[PDB]
Design a protein around this ligand. Sequence first.
Ligand SMILES: Cn1nccc1Nc1nccc(-c2ccn([C@H](CO)c3ccc(Cl)c(F)c3)c(=O)c2)n1
Length: 282
Amino acid sequence: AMENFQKVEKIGEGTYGVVYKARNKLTGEVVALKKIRVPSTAIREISLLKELNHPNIVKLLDVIHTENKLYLVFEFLHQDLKKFMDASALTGIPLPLIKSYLFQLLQGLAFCHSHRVLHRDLKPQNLLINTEGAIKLADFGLARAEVVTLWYRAPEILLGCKYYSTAVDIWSLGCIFAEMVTRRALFPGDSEIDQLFRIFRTLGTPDEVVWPGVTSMPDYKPSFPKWARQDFSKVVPPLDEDGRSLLSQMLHYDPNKRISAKAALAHPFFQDVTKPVPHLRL
Ligand SMILES: Cn1nccc1Nc1nccc(-c2ccn([C@H](CO)c3ccc(Cl)c(F)c3)c(=O)c2)n1
């Protein structure tokens, strides 16, 4: 099984696996090999993911289930968005590239969501880029299948909703959009309550007016402090009014009011979208 792969170097770790750059000794392919750690339900879900192919989803090439361990073989990309943001931080990512990346990831999400597949853990480290200007979603579907970052968590998850929706991915992508534009994380919480209260300090403590049902959510407390909302003009300067209007719709508290990926693709912010090429030093 694995004897067919030659490890080159380590490129990631999760709470349950390690990812190596590796070479397929068979095909000559260079790949990302994720070594996990097997429940049959996980096998069938992962198998369904192999069919979920889109230009903005990192391709799952092979699933090897062997010596009762699990290897996932992915398309290799040379950089993630976290590294590209850090590399770009003196100057910032140019707006047309931010806009191209947001549009592409919304295409990725629209495709996944149309097949009822949620990502659930979008973050810059899971967004992979190449020299041609493409950006792709990684780790897609693997959640339903080493401190965990909370920064991009939708508030319905933080408030204990078990049966949340595709809207959680739009919230995460909105947080990443804001971070591209300002070169700072939007809500960098370091615990669940710190995350929730950073959201409330910026967008206002949610109530029944803006989010019907919120006061009955599992981890909602009447004792939450009540902060007023701030203007987006203060939150993501100097993003223009189209970009701010789109971000506001992606960060609506009520997941049912939050914009869908498909609707976001029609937003006027993308009327002049283009596909620039990044400066990548590899
Ligand atoms: C060279 N380089 N630098 C950064 C990324 C890459 N290239 C690359 N190419 C294809 C896939 C991946 C890739 C990376 C990280 N992860 C996550 C990061 O959150 C990850 C989740 C779960 C566990 Cl268990 C893990 F170890 C790593 C991927 O899923 C998949 N990376």
